[PDB]
Design a protein around this ligand. Structure first.
Ligand SMILES: [Zn+2]
Ligand SMILES: [Zn+2]
Lengths: 56, 147, 122, 116, 49, 59, 56, 82
């Protein structure tokens, strides 16, 4: 993100959400979670579409 | 691994190496084409000792000199002799091969065509780095051991 | 390092030729009739596991670059802890996470690599 | 002249690796040694075999002036402007080929535009 | 650029209730975010927490 | 996108470019990125560039 | 439990060292690449497992 | 008194966002986009190829919205009505 320095390989930088959902997520955590999330839905749409047709 | 040797972490390795496709590319640090015209004296210091050593119990002035890396060289359980007589059995006689031995601090295969030379060599240099199979079965690229 | 030469006159590329008689290396042009004796005998070099490009990026302003991370190690030339570090700028997978730092006082590049083999890093 | 061309591509005389990548380019364009033969070479790969040299050259002269990198300049005197840009292209291309650069991220947003 | 998340990330025990937010290690900030909840669109701007 | 030329001592260009835009004298929407380690300073004026506002932190 | 949260916060902050140590390790060039795996390939591999062993 | 050089607090951001929205509203990307067209880009299209081998086209005048009334006055068109 433009909020870290260049070549930052720490967990916080590279996308470890430290917090529980109870605690709430930092904006980075929130956006990285959003990234992982979008990966999920994207290929939840793939798994639905390919599986749909395999089964047929 | 064969029943009798399953635990032998060293035989797992010895098979791993003898299976994992191991190209010249993976064991050579750099290639260089020198004009080095006299097949006795040489414009390369670190090789004077090696031509001397290959006179004890034709050739173009253009020399293809490969500097090999011990790291991956002994890792893949490999001999200079083995790398050498491989290239020497890959290019029939169509290449004069000579190599530093396994003691010498720098590992070196020196090769000549045997005039449109500098070009046949950059071809052969490639036919080496890419094509020649030092060790392993082709298409087996990584080979991981696991318990 | 096969630093190679262009003709004095026409300024095209020179191509290596052999003095068959005296056994030495020339470099004719193939446009004009120019020719020069060879410097080193090294006509070709193919660096399989490369270095050059790891330093690439080192500018008089590198430290003005705010996105660069800044540590406080000591440079083996002027000891000033005004450093700005990046990883090897080559973009291979088989690159290390070796950091390169630039001293922003004497503009010196040094390295976190404890296996230092090279001298100029160029 | 080679030296000149390479200077447009390779802004670094020590970068022997890049210049050594181009070695065969310099060779690949060996047959052609002056702007007109070059302009003709192009003309011919844009034209039918019937067409006359001048027209051919003139076709290649208009393509380089209007089709080749048109966002630089479409008028006349700007040949160095394209040579240089084209050099820079060949540059970046090789700088990528030499495992010295990451190939462009297609999905970076700064290099997208939203049409509205 | 280098952007601060909250202005208070410029500033030169911790609530156990609070989330755990990253350090402010940089005197290099060229910008700071107005408010990070402005990374959201409209639909998402309605979602509480 | 157009290579317009060259400039030794860019940061002194960069300052001004930034300061001009921060006045109003260069249009705010105009985007200038200096890639220090690339020897490049790319200015952008074309429409379509999605942008957002930020607080300027200056020393 | 108030304390569990400290154990949890500790558990995590105990992995960010592990990750940090492997970072320092690798930036030094002391991490040996696992056979047929790049440094960068195997550094991540470690970090990801640390951060998972952690979450878990 | 509330030093007019005191640093901004996290709270204050909203004020700036208020200002942002006061000024631009929620669909500026549309309007400005369409406006820069009507104001400039429009007239800039009537100057490219504004020459025929003469007839050259000059200024552009954009009316307020109006209707082609079948039987009657070219009428001031109100959005709601439309
Ligand atoms: Zn010449
Ligand atoms: Zn120093």
């Amino acid at each position: 993100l433009p909020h870290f320095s260049k070549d930052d390989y720490s967990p916080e930088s590279k996308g470890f959400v430290e917090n529980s959902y109870l605690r709430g997520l930092t904006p980075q955590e929130f956006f990285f979670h959003a990234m992982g999330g979008r990966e999920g839905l994207i290929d939840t749409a793939v798994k639905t579409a390919e599986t749909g047709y395999i089964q047929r | 691994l064969e029943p009798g040797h399953a635990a032998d972490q060293e035989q797992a390795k010895l098979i791993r190496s003898a299976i994992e496709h191991t190209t010249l590319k993976s064991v050579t640090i750099a290639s260089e084409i020198y004009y080095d015209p006299d097949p006795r004296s040489t414009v390369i210091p670190e090789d004077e000792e090696i031509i001397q050593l290959h006179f004890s119990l034709q050739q173009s002035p253009w020399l293809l000199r490969l500097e090999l890396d011990r790291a991956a060289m002994n890792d893949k359980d490999l001999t200079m002799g083995q790398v050498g007589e491989r290239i020497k059995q890959t290019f029939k006689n169509d290449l004069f091969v000579i190599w530093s031995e396994d003691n010498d601090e720098k590992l070196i295969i020196r090769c000549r065509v045997v005039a449109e030379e500098d070009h046949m060599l950059k071809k052969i240099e490639n036919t080496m780095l890419e094509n020649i199979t030092l060790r392993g079965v082709e298409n087996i690229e990584r080979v991981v051991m696991m318990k | 390092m096969t630093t190679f030469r262009f003709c004095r006159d026409c300024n095209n590329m020179l191509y290596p030729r052999e003095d068959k008689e005296n056994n030495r290396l020339l470099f004719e042009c193939r446009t004009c009739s120019y020719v020069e004796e060879a410097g080193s005998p090294l006509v070709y070099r193919h660096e399989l596991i490369t270095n050059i490009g790891e330093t690439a990026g080192v500018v008089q302003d590198i430290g003005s670059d705010p996105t660069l991370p800044r540590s406080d190690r000591e440079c083996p030339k002027c000891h000033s802890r005004e450093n700005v570090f990046f990883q090897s700028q080559q973009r291979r997978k088989d690159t290390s996470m070796v950091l390169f730092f630039v001293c922003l006082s004497c503009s010196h590049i040094f390295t976190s690599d404890q296996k230092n083999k090279r001298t100029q890093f160029s | 002249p080679d030296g000149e061309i390479l200077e447009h591509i390779c802004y670094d005389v020590n970068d022997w690796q890049m210049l050594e990548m181009l070695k065969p380019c310099v060779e690949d364009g060996f047959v052609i040694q002056d702007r007109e033969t070059a302009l003709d070479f192009i003309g011919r790969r844009g034209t039918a075999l019937g067409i006359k040299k001048e027209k051919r050259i003139q076709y290649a002269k208009d393509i380089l002036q209007k089709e080749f990198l048109p966002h630089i300049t479409q008028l006349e005197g700007f040949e160095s402007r394209k040579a240089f840009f084209l050099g820079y292209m060949i540059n970046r291309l090789l700088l990528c080929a030499l495992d010295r650069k990451d190939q462009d991220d297609r999905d970076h947003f700064g290099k997208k535009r939203l049409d509205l | 650029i280098l952007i601060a998340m909250q202005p208070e990330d410029l500033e030169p025990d911790v609530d156990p209730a609070k989330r755990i937010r990253v350090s402010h290690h940089a005197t290099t900030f060229t910008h700071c975010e107005i408010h990070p909840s402005m990374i959201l669109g409209v639909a998402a701007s309605i979602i509480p927490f | 996108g157009v290579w317009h030329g060259v400039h030794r001592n860019p940061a002194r260009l960069m300052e001004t470019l930034r300061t001009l835009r921060r006045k109003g004298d260069i249009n705010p929407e105009v985007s200038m990125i200096r890639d220090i380690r690339e020897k490049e300073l790319k200015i952008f004026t074309d429409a379509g560039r999605v942008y957002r506002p930020l607080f300027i932190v200056e020393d | 439990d108030g304390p569990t949260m400290r154990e949890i916060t500790e558990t995590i902050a105990e992995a960010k060292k592990k990750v940090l140590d492997v970072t320092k390790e690798a930036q030094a060039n002391l991490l040996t690449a696992k056979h047929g795996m790049t440094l960068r390939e195997s550094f991540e591999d470690n970090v990801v497992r640390f951060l998972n062993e952690a979450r878990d | 008194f509330e030093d007019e050089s005191a640093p901004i607090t996290a709270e204050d951001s909203w004020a700036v966002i208020s200002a942002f929205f006061r000024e631009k509203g929620l669909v500026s990307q549309q309007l400005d986009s369409f406006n820069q067209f009507v104001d400039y880009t429009l007239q800039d299209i009537i100057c490219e190829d504004s020459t025929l081998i003469e007839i050259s086209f000059g200024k552009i005048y954009v009316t307020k919205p109006m209707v082609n009334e079948s039987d009657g006055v070219t009428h001031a068109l109100y959005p709601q009505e439309a």
